Structure 1
Amino acid sequence: FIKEPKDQIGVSGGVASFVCQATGDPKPRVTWNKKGKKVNSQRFETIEFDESAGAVLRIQPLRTPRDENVYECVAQNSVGEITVHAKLTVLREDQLPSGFPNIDMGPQLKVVERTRTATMLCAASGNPDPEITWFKDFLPVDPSASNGRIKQLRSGALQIESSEETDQGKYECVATNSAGVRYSSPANLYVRVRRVAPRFSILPMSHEIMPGGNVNITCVAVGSPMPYVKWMQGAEDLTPEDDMPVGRNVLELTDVKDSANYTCVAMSSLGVIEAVAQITVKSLPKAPGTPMVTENTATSITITWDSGNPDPVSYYVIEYKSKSQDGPYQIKEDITTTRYSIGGLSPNSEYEIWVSAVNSIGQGPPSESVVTRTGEQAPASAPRNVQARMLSATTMIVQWEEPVEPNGLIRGYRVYYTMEPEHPVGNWQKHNVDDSLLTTVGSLLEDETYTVRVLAFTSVGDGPLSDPIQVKTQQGVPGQPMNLRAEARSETSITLSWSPPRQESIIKYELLFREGDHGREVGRTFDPTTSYVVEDLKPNTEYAFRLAARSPQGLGAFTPVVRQRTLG
């Protein structure tokens, strides 16, 4: 017997619970007997607990002298049988000592929600002060067995720290002392279970991160029952069920590279709901979208272009090339506007232009291109291989090749000529020509030497004059030699060279030269070639040469003075 029933002194019309528990091996089946055999009655009642191991005897309302007996608690297993006894005395109210316990305030009908605490009141008085006991659904309550959740207070009440459905019942408080026992009126405690389907306190939050790249997705969900929180990627779960948290569940992702979605799954017996946060890995930009030309100049193009991107963009990169002379690509980095002027171009050329955008991940693809042409300019160069001969004794035919650097559609040429070249060229005789590469002029004085110089022009303006060619109006004699070049062969030698003559049959060439400015004029005649090597000269000194051709009719015009020096 781990509990033994005490003798009780009770009140008429009151209650009297006798407690009797046993133990051992085998486990017993207890009983309650009066005078040997269990002569049962209406007002008496047994409430067996722990599978008939211990059992309370309850009597109510108490009557005197009917109920005043010694009662036997039987206890037996396969091996052993021992009784224990207890007496009941039952007094009327009018014959109670002054000190007999009295319930000043018993418990009240109480309602409370699960896990929240419940303080069941009981206040008594007597001499000596009575120790309080509680019965719930006719069974005594033991604060020890509750894990310190339930506890009796000196002041009187019984405290339930965390409510549970099981804590519901009729409650009776009982004031016990040397005089005897007194019960309170019963009072129910209800423990209501509010049914609330789940919702999210904090939703799972979408993010944009860099590649690797790490983010904690928090997800909080509340309700009643308080819902479990796990993570899913599509159809598969990620959090396990060994220690799956409730209410909260953070997902710490690390080293992310692919943009993936994630579902938080709030779940309980009442219902399931879900919310999806999408992690996105910031990507490269998109093509800025075809640029457009605003201005042009001889040397510049300037353009504007749409961002082409929903997110902002660190800067832009222009790439371009001359379509005219394919290649190479030119770059302009670190452009921080949607407007740019590409300068340092060459006039009258057309360029294909693209645009790319850069963000913190890198540089995106390029736009579609825009082809466009730079404006015109005056030519940077003169007509080439300018030539002249006589058709008659008084008219001259001149021709030339168009200049390598026209900077524009060539609108014509202009031809300056005279036989007093020491004047400025602007004073010379001059007239215009069309884009053709050849003209004539007459009204020339017979047996003379005219010098001729030619320039090209465009809508914009004049180019440079060619270098002076000159022609003698005597006919039959050959023309002035072409592009006479002189270059140093050795420390005592110079190699003269010139372009092959046109049609005219030259008998011999006539060469004249001298040392520096003030040296003796040497003369040499030789058979027709395009080059001649001058031998036996002085080291590191300068010589001046000029050349003319001879035909049967006579001596042609001389070149201008060409100068070159021997090695040194």
Structure 2
Amino acid sequence: ETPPRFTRTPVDQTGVSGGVASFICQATGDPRPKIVWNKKGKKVSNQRFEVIEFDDGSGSVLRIQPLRTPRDEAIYECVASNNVGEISVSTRLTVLREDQIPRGFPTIDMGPQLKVVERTRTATMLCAASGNPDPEITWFKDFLPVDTSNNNGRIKQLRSESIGALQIEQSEESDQGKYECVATNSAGTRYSAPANLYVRVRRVPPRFSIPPTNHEIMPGGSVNITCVAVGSPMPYVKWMLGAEDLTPEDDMPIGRNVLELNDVRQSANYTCVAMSTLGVIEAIAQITVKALPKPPGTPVVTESTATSITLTWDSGNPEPVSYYIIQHKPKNSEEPYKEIDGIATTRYSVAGLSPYSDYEFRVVAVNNIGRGPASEPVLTQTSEQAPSSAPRDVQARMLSSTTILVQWKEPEEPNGQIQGYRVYYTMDPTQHVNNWMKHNVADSQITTIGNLVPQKTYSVKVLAFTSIGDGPLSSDIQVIT
């Protein structure tokens, strides 16, 4: 929230009896400031005082017409306020009689003219005024000031050395209204008479700008559906159920009927009817109720590798499913299921898994309504591999001149049940490993080897094996008998 701050303050004015005076006050703040006009100290009430508001609520214009003097001759003020703060600015109004209107006071030599431009074509409203010093020309539309501040806009104020005009680049229905030009200088202010501007739109039968688009949802179960029609003359947009009109009869709105539905208990068809004097046009929306999908058939494992598992499942649903979501995690991992989104078939291979691991699964169905309940789970296990790492911390030491003790720790990557180990040893480590002497052992971390020849350097290497095959050999260690 921010307190109100002035974007545009009213200026002193010097008008002429039986004329117009306008005061402008704009302010910004959060929430939107209210603007109030005071004559010390009173909310202004009168038949000739009129407060006109900007469409954006930026503020308001105090318009005094016709000026009668010296009642109106006074100090007025604008107060902008929200529940965060308050600001005010004062301003003076002077009204003169033409008995005592100074010469050189702004005079309208020619005022704006009634004009009819068609849409999107450039219209020009013109103002000739003289005075000494030379009068500055400004414009008012529907009592509000016309903003031509941006040189870069549709609407630009041109002034030449001969007094100026207002140029509207691209016409809109919004442009239509009552324009008056205003000649000001250091002596005062004078208005021209109002000249209306009208804009002709070619007569067109009605047409749907935004037709009403079909839906499905679970019961109770609500939706707002928009029907927009446009054309000239702009039509009435009436929402019609088959025969009966929801909207009463006394009210048919223009160009926009948006329908609110509570508790869509049943499937239905609805009609949006738009009509003007040139025709009736119609358009239907299909409202049907269907639920979220049923849980899929329980997943079945039909393929497995050491790093993948392929699932197949029944759709479990009477109507077509858009796609599936597969839920997966390790048998005892307890974070919420990891999910693979956007699976467009009833079979999928989950890859990037680890060898010899237990996995948990479910399948979820998704249709246009949304996401259904997860299927019942299936448990399974990835295949084994040969180990992908050597036994760790391999050590050997002398027991006697003829026997040694070899030990190791389990490989970090067994990729399966360790069925055993193979111990390779030799006095010549340059041989191929298949030509070393070999000692097979069951699952264990230590063994003894005898019948060695004394006072020799033996090189030793160890691997693990699963049901699949041999793992890698440890790098050579040496032991001396």
Name the TM-score class by shorter chain: 0.3 to 0.5
Q: Which has the higher contact order (CA 8 A, sep 6+)?
A: 2
TM superposition score normalised by structure 1: 0.37
Tell me the TM-score normalised to structure 2 length.
0.43
Q: Which has the larger radius of gyration?
A: 1
